[PDB]
């Protein structure tokens, strides 16, 4: 009945040694990819926030200094959380970095992306609603073993699922930290905030939304002049990635709404032709679980996505896989009867990819019959891959946990909305 | 530029060293036995103590409150006092004094009757007031009304200070001195509008609602809300729910969670009249801000129908509108059911955002008038929601161009719980 | 090391889920009508509500206080509760309950009589207590005394946790559980000693007095002090001034300014007995900490004489000493007058820092005994300051090696204001 | 009274929208390679950036700092900028600009030589300046000294704003505009005095040193202090220790702990001139504040003799005094030894708090002159401590009533480490 991996699972083991860094993770730390946020936890004493790093070829060893913090949540006290931004990195260079410089040093590595550009290829993993059940471990293995070979994960929210435990037992953030480390210590994960990150629990006097998640997973939101960690953009290779918060305000005149309207004007499709939006709650979703929860955001932002010709919108939240047709539903005017989606070659494809495991439960009840806006849907565990070839073509595939690591149960060519708007 | 100039009589500084100014009150508890007393001192911090006594008991007590200050760009505020008087007697006239240390000023208010089934009560409805000459006329029409408003339900957009350069917060101070002649003597129930957001990254002011939330306090914890921007009060026979159009309301957010559990706590056997206040109207056939209320409608409209809300008041559109009782809660993306229909279980939606703002009326309407809209007109004015008993409340809309006793629109509400009968005009 | 082990009986954890522990009370206002109720819960934050009733009227009432936490290096505190009960009736037994949500525990205390000229009261005097076995024997002698102390005047150095590695704040927890059998039932008046400073920059803990000040609250605002470390209370016929040896006391500083105004507020027609507490002694003829009190003496000794202070109690030296009435205030740099003289307007200075500490007595004394020193001895013990009326107070010192009713030293105090007879 | 009126020329507000005012600099690191740049903008927040370049390179760089504000009773401050420029070159003139967003103003300073055994350097000594007409005359005399002061060691009591009703902090702003003509072009080294405490509970202002600590930053973490009110710096051949008379200094306290460790780091072969600054004098034979320094003297006087401090500079007494080299550290309560004695290991104690304050001089003296006092006079003026090399430093005192080149008192300091002969 509980498919969550027990506490003594191998994926949760504590790196040995006095004050050994654990829960190590990295993410892009600037707007174009010359910087990296390095994050980790030490449990025995505060320790140093210094990060030692060097490129595998030059080898001059540099130190970066960051910041230490802690938080409480009901009767849980966190370890000592470190966040340190390494900057001015060279493009397309393998770096080594070390954490724990005062006591037990641990060494990792990452490869910086190429410089942003029109035809730069890059491979993104899509993972949503991961959790720490056995299905979660299989998904992460299927991603690590992908022959497509993913270089950055776009994570569309719902991370540890710790809020399911009594009092949100934040020990389950620590176990998730150690479990995902074997991926996100070596390549950036791009964080979207889901509903399991809100952790609004007034009954135990914890009413600050996103508190544990926000303390543990930093994002470079200032780099795109956002005033909140929960919405932001980054550019990587030939992609411009916009990260939105389903569970923050997006009313007209609110900060998120203001930021996004202004951020879409800065997109340059001749520098980054692939325009990608991440959000947690899907705007198009023909499952019963969470059906039409995305309507509110859709009324605010769908016309914008069409007007600026977003290529693809990735969401999670529904524990299943779905791929829409290119449609829009933006002609409604209350009394004009125009409330059915139509094909629209200026509209993104919406993909739901919230099926990486969560706590062991798949969403299988679909609306019937399958609506026209729904191109493909299936209730199986898996992950996605968005493989950009060049300015016109990107190949998307869905890998199921029950198939071999090189089998795509679904696959579609994306034809760029700016450089190549062919029907797909 | 129809805003009143700085040396207008309504803006005068009360005389005397450190005379309290911008005095205002609002309900300070869930049921009406408390008042939050608020004012500003400009010359020095002064005391936060409030001396108060009832006309009959005569015993003079002291309440102690708190002082705060804020900055916004290159404006620094004076000294803001918030003091809550508690454990008052119902239906009792009280005097209170502020500015104990140097220049004292005396005012009065009348606590509401105890909450009960047939308790009559007359609520003013004012939205988008601003500080134009139109604003002053409306306030004059409200205070001279023959129906005698006892509480103002204020549906957002207060000072419009954010239209001035750097949101020149002096225009918050002027508005507090203007409105004082009403809100020092009777509560105003505050809803946050978009002019209260004051999100201004270009001058490093990124904290939404900061001036408003410093100047106007609400009893939000009394309904176990975690934020000033949504909360609930009961007063006489009304249960009043105040929502924030410019806060989060997705599933699982604080305001969504609070609202869902707040609706369950409404007892129509105790407070018959269920009133919702918000700034952006769910139903609005004017072109200005057309369909901006759609996002909140998708989350909450079915909840309003399920709980048989009597009336939803909003502002934002600078005009007046009264809807039919309608719902639009059957849409399923592909089924074509996106037209509102008559629904006796649904509230009446009233836009009342025509109190004056900076002097501009919203006249462009969508033609012809849709079936869902009962009455609309692009004129300045205000409203009165006059509860008679558990079955009947009389709503009336008064225009600034008419005399203060003339109702250009008028409807008898049949209470959705105790008199669930078609009340359309 | 003579510190009692962690498994000692005195350190037992009260049973039951989130049972309040480390329960301590102190006077909560200026005149004795309020009490600060303090305790720690370990399993979860719990309620800060205190339920209380007098013996006389038996009406249960609720007072609500505040919860707080702190960190010190790699230690995290439990949940600390401070709640003030007010409007208590004079000379009256109260019962109070803490832990209202899970495991409740009930205690009692007796308010002092109203302040007046001739109101009798017995103050205990305990200094540099620690948690050695010697500390336990002192505490036992106090609670078994036939003199029956009604309040402890505590002259500083509490737990000595700062002697443990990283000041192991677990040893504050043990001390609170150990002292509870006394301070849960009668107020202790806190003075801050040097072991409470805990200035440890080498582990980035630089806020002076931080652990002490979170765990032990004083009614400092009731005498218009701006700092917990100096303040005044009145109780029965006593006006008690508590001073901070390790805060600033230069001319113009907060402590200096507060003390100058506060001596002018003493009304000996209401509280005849004027008592000053401080950690470091102004008159001390032992070698350990010899002359460390000179700095405060230069600043405050002439004030104590001018305001006819009856007695100054201090700790810091791990032994007992009682001075004659002397002053050393005629010094003008070049006039040679630096010898203390008998001055029947001066206080008696008493060192009483011998309650046990970590098991070490200070036995090195300057020989021969100076004329200013009336009696001194290197033995563990405590004091009793037993007020009879406005003229007469009996002070006695009890040694840990004697019977609980044996006074190894005693002296009648004749009040400096109401009865200035030679009491040599 | 005798304070200069608000419309005086020294108080004039620099013109242009949001033009920086109250510009002041101080040393920014331990050894002299850094400078803290400080200033106020009144019209809006503005930029905290400082553009700077050397006269030699001309490569203009930018350093970014921080903006802060404070209230005090019914006063609200302007926007206070502190920005630290680092990696400066030794012995080099730099220009710097503040006010980059609207009205830019330009200044300059000259970095000190690198620290060394025989490095000459000329220090000014000012205490208790205030803003009376007397204060302006002392500043003029300092600016016009033929010895050319390169840094001011300032021993406390700055604006005397706390004498006005509610400490009227406008009188901090004016003092900032008045002193700028000096402290914008050379560091002043800041010591906290009693008029900086501003403990005013009757108007609910209880944070000690608040207005001063907002407006004047020091490089206290460079010497591993945890408080701005005590710290050290090295400059040329001087090691300078700044103490806080009005902070705690009992055994085990932060300032006590810091001073005992700091004295162990002193290297007389790198900086042979060991200098202590404090506000309250440990030696003082005037009736005003007589013996107020006794408490700090019980704690620190033996450390000064032990480490052979050359000179201790203090203010607070509104006059001038130069002690003999004496110590008074033998007292043991009953041994009777409480008279100071000639001590060639001891520093000279100079009271130099006569720079003007609000117009009033302290003229009552203990009579007769004690053996431990060498020279004392109740006149307005300032001091100069002129280091020639590791053995010789010339101290001069200049009175406001004399010519700017006249030294009414002067003495040769022989270094206690390198040349401890009777002076
Ligand atoms: C806080 O830091 C202390 C200093 O490192 C910890 O004590 C050290 O723990 C080591 C185990 O990792 C042990 O080898 C060292 O001997 C010991 N050092 C000293 C000076 O005692 C302390 O760890 C606690 O105590 C030890 C004995 C273990 O039992 C730990 O499990 C304890 O938690 C640290 N405490 C905490 C709460 O992190
Ligand atoms: C962008 O990448 C696409 C995927 O690799 C290219 O399409 C592929 O081009 C191959 C030629 O190298 C061809 O065999 C494959 O069939 C084809 N794949 C698909 C799904 O069409 C694309 O190549 C250009 O466009 C195609 C349609 C042909 O015209 C080629 O001759 C072109 O080089 C790449 N486009 C660009 C601009 O590089
Ligand atoms: C509740 O308030 C209603 C509005 O004031 C009352 O109806 C009004 O009753 C008046 C006489 O009491 C009558 O002149 C008004 O025309 C009438 N107003 C309307 C809009 O109908 C109502 O009184 C009951 O209902 C009316 C229709 C009559 O039948 C009365 O005799 C009834 O008592 C009030 N209800 C009660 C129980 O008083
Ligand atoms: C204040 O307390 C003193 C200590 O108890 C009283 O002195 C004691 O009085 C007894 C008779 O009440 C007598 O037997 C004891 O010997 C005496 N103790 C001492 C140490 O002197 C004192 O009583 C007054 O003073 C004494 C000296 C006698 O004159 C008594 O007759 C007096 O009443 C108490 N003061 C008052 C005013 O009661
Ligand atoms: C350090 O500076 C001192 C002051 O300038 C030097 O003393 C001065 O030396 C001059 C020529 O050497 C001589 O004309 C001056 O009268 C004399 N000033 C004084 C106040 O004595 C000092 O020179 C050395 O020291 C003195 C004592 C003599 O022995 C000279 O002959 C020495 O050169 C300078 N010391 C050093 C080490 O540079
Ligand atoms: C504000 O109130 C206080 C207390 O009621 C008065 O003392 C003030 O009077 C002024 O301040 C005192 C200190 C004294 O100078 C008096 O003469 C002043 O008039 C009062 N302030 C004013 C401006 O009336
Ligand atoms: C101070 O500098 C800022 C930044 O360069 C300018 O924006 C200000 O210019 C004034 O305000 C702007 C918005 C623009 O309208 C300009 O025309 C104004 O002069 C500048 N302020 C002043 C007073 O020069
Ligand atoms: C998780 O998967 C990894 C990689 O396949 C495997 O080595 C590990 O044993 C698995 N652990 C659990 C608990 O499933
Ligand atoms: C502050 O208060 C004093 C009186 O207490 C008044 O005279 C002065 O002008 C006030 N200053 C400001 C800036 O309000
Ligand atoms: C506002 O209205 C009041 C009463 O109607 C009037 O006395 C006052 O002069 C008006 N002020 C204006 C229009 O500025
Ligand atoms: C402490 O003293 C008490 C009372 O004398 C006794 O019951 C207890 O056993 C003692 N404990 C220790 C550890 O000495
Ligand atoms: C927190 O509280 C729960 C009881 O609700 C308990 O089971 C758990 O062990 C506690 N953990 C900590 C670290 O206090
Ligand atoms: C201050 O002194 C300067 C230089 O001596 C002079 O120019 C100025 O006029 C003086 N100002 C006042 C107010 O004395
Ligand atoms: C604030 O700034 C504006 C220009 O940006 C200026 O005109 C105005 O007078 C300023 N106000 C204050 C109070 O400084
Ligand atoms: Fe999920
Ligand atoms: Fe409006
Ligand atoms: Fe001790
Ligand atoms: Fe002075
Ligand atoms: Na939602
Ligand atoms: Na809106
Ligand atoms: Na001391
Ligand atoms: Zn979800
Ligand atoms: Zn609006
Ligand atoms: Zn001690
Ligand atoms: Zn001084």
Hetero ligands? a molecule of 3 linked components (NAG-FUC-NAG), a molecule of 2 linked components (NAG-FUC), 2-acetamido-2-deoxy-beta-D-glucopyranose, fe (iii) ion, sodium ion, zinc ion
- SSE series of chain A: EEEEEEEEEEEHEHEHEEHEHEEEEEEEEE
Oligomer: homotetramer
Number of strands of chain A: 25
- Any idea of the CATH class of the largest domain in chain A? Alpha Beta
Shape label of chain A? globular
Protein chains sharing the most extensive interface: C-D, 39 and 41 residues
Number of domains of chain A: 2
Largest sheet of chain A: 7 strands, mixed
Radius of gyration of chain A: 21 Å
Structural classification of chain A: alpha+beta
Residues in β-strands, percent of chain A: 25-35%
C-alpha termini separation of chain A: 42 Å
Number of helices of chain A: 5
CATH topology of the largest domain in chain A: Purple Acid Phosphatase, chain A, domain 2
Biggest sheet, spatial arrangement of strands of chain A: 14-15-16-17-21-18-22
* Helical residue percent band of chain A: 10-25%
CATH architecture of the largest domain in chain A: 4-Layer Sandwich
């Amino acid at each position: 009945k509980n498919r969550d991996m027990p506490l003594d699972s191998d994926v949760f083991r504590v790196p040995p040694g006095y004050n050994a860094p654990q829960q190590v993770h990295i993410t892009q730390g600037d707007l174009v990819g010359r910087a990296m946020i390095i994050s980790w936890v030490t449990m025995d004493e505060p320790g140093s926030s210094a990060v030692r790093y060097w490129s595998e070829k030059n080898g001059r060893k540099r130190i970066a200094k960051g910041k230490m913090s802690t938080y409480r949540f009901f009767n849980y006290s966190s370890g000592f959380i470190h966040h340190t931004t390494i900057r001015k990195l060279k493009y397309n260079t393998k770096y080594y970095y070390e954490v724990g410089l005062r006591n037990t040093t641990r060494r990792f590595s990452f490869i910086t992306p190429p410089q942003t550009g029109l035809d730069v290829p890059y491979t993104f993993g899509l993972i949503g609603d991961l959790g720490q059940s056995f299905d979660s471990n299989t998904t992460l293995s299927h991603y690590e073993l992908s022959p497509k070979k993913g270089q950055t994960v776009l994570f569309v929210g719902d991370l540890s699922y710790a809020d399911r435990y009594p009092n949100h037992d934040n020990v389950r953030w620590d176990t998730w930290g150690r479990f995902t480390e074997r991926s996100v210590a070596y390549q950036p994960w791009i964080w979207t905030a889901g509903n399991h990150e809100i952790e609004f629990a007034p009954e135990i006097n914890e009413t600050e939304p996103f508190k544990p998640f926000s303390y543990r997973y930093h994002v470079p939101y200032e780099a795109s002049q956002s005033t909140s960690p929960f919405w932001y953009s980054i550019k990587r290779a030939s992609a411009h990635i916009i990260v939105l918060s389903s569970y923050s305000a997006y009313g007209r005149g609110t900060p998120q709404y203001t930021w996004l309207k202004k951020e879409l004007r800065k997109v340059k499709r001749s520098e980054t032709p692939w325009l990608i939006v991440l959000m947690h709650s899907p705007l198009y979703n023909s499952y019963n679980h969470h059906f039409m929860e995305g309507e509110a955001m859709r009324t605010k932002f769908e016309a914008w996505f069409v007007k600026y010709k977003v290529d693809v919108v990735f969401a999670g939240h529904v524990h299943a896989y779905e791929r829409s047709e290119r449609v829009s539903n933006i002609a409604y005017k209350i009394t004009n009867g125009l409330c059915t989606p139509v094909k629209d070659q200026s509209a993104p494809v919406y993909i739901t990819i919230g099926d990486a495991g969560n706590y062991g439960v798949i969403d299988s009840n679909m609306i019937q019959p399958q609506p026209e806006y729904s191109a493909f849907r299936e209730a199986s565990f898996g992950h996605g891959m968005f493989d950009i070839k060049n300015r016109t073509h990107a190949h998307f595939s869905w890998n199921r946990n029950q198939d071999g690591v090189a089998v795509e149960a679904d696959s579609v060519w994306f034809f760029n909305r700016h450089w190549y708007p062919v029907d797909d």
